[PDB]
Structures are given as structure tokens and as C-alpha cells.
Write a protein that binds this DNA or RNA. Structure first.
Lengths: 142, 139
DNA sequence: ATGATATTATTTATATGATAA
DNA sequence: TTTATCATATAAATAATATCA
């Protein structure tokens, strides 16, 4: 029998693990580098719900992670001028060289991994990922 | 490209759809994945390797095993040949439980792959293999 | 020299217990 | 509040060398 879904979970596990290994010198947890990775790529005006989903933890879990990152001095959480229940999540000046380390491993690691496959594979695969995700979310609505 | 982030999102939404369809069963995500893998694999397979199939470390598998044993869903009889090795297998009372879990996993996989073509599935399958192997080469 | 074992280190299998996510 | 995790503990099988009535 196919165990395709499980095989896909394993692939993501080992991809993450490889990145986590390469980042071993920063001494950050995986939720930490994944959180910082996503804060950098996502606008500060965006809500915690939207940040939490991209990262893959729940909203309350994100609050705990953001607490840790603020104590470390890597982010600030300041109230927005246009909406007073919303807070902008911004990387601090001093995080800049850490973000460079995380982004570089992530990017290099992807290039190395996808460097071992055909354009057809990459394209067919990239499109399917979007399609299957699309289907599941619909099924979840049903 | 965010292909890693993309794959990770797919994985999580797919698991969450299975979890949702299994809700009335009131098993934690960790329990139902473990039950599924215990049923899939030979009992001779190690605890380190069972954890590998599941996606967890062995201390996390041990407490999960205690809980499942608590519920009388699994036994861990100590191997008569190797007094430090154990035999993990489902009980008879877990028979209708695994039938549920397996049922939902197979039906959901078969459903998710609907609408997509034969050579597209062949790529998803062939690339999990190649990329995992290539990631295993690194590290 | 013999068997009977004993002494120590290595590796493999599983388990626990403080905390940290 | 569970829940999982890190660095450990038992513990049995593995194996190399050593000791004696």
C-alpha cells in the first residue's frame, strides 16, 4: 500500500532537520529560527493569526515564542497608529546578522536540495503542492 | 521559492484534515499516528525505528506507549530471546479502533489525489524518494 | 594446560524524571 | 493543564582479556 502522506511528512521532517543542523552554531530552537524566518518575510501590520499559521504553531504558542524573542532583544511589539488592538511585529536592528545566517542556510539548503532534480520535476511538483493544498482546505470546508 | 515552507504547510493541513475526520474518536494526534504505524510495521522493528516512522524521538514514543498500554490498546511483552528487547503489537480491543484510523487515512489519501493526473502523482511519489535520499546524503 | 568463570568495556533496547516548549 | 524532550539511568547481550583450584 502507498503511505504517501506519511512519506511526505518524513521529507519535511528531514528538510527541517538539515536546516536545524546547519544552524547549530546560533543555538536557537527550531520554533525560534522558523519564527524569525517568517517575521522577516511577513509585513508587521499582519496579525498574529496570520503569522502563526505560516510558522505552524497555534496563536497562543506564537505569543510564548514572541515573548522569548523580545527578551533576547530580537523583535519589538509596538501598538500600531491606525489600529490600537493590533501590534506590529518588527525585527530589531541587532537581529540583522542573525537573520542573515538563518536566511542564507534556508536559501542555500533549498538550492542544494532542488539542485538535484529536473525542471519538469520541480515545476510539476511545485504546482501539485498548491493543488493538493487547495483541495484539502476545500475538503476541510465540507 | 518557498518550496520547503510549502511542503510543510501541505503536510500540516493534510494531517489536520485527518485529525478532524477522526475527532469523535477522541485520540490525540500523537496516539492515532502511533497506532497507525504500530499496525503498519512488523513488531520486530525497533523502538528507535518505530519512532522514525512516526516522526518522534524514543523518549516521546515511550510515554505514548505507556498511555496506549494504559488504555489496553497495545502490549509490550519482553522478548524471550532478548530480555532487553520488547514486542509492540495491538490488542484485540484495538481492532475496531485501528479499523477507524486506517479507514480515514486510506480514504483521505485516495480523495486528496483525486483531480490530479497519473504522471503528476508519479512525480510527487518519485520526488519524495529522490529528495529524501539526497537530504540523507547531506547532513 | 583445562574448564569454569570472572572481570571490565561496548553496544543495543528501553525506561524515567526535571522542566521547557 | 498536558506533553514532549534532554540527558541521563537500567539492563541485557557482546566481546575482549584475565584468573584459578
Amino acid at each position: 500500500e502507498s503511505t504517501l502522506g506519511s512519506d511526505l511528512a518524513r521529507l519535511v521532517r528531514v528538510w527541517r532537520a538539515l536546516i536545524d543542523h546547519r544552524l547549530k552554531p546560533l543555538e536557537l530552537t527550531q520554533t525560534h529560527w522558523v519564527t524569525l524566518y517568517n517575521i522577516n518575510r511577513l509585513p508587521p501590520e499582519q496579525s498574529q493569526i496570520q503569522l502563526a499559521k505560516a510558522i505552524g504553531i497555534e496563536q497562543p504558542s506564537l505569543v510564548r515564542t514572541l515573548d522569548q524573542l523580545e527578551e533576547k532583544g530580537l523583535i519589538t511589539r509596538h501598538t500600531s497608529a491606525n489600529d490600537r488592538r493590533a501590534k506590529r511585529i518588527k525585527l530589531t536592528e541587532q537581529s540583522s546578522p542573525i537573520i542573515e545566517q538563518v536566511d542564507g542556510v534556508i536559501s542555500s539548503t533549498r538550492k542544494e536540495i532542488l539542485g538535484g532534480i529536473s525542471s519538469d520535476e520541480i515545476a510539476v511538483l511545485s504546482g501539485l503542492i498548491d493543488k493538493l493544498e487547495k483541495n484539502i482546505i476545500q475538503l476541510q470546508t465540507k
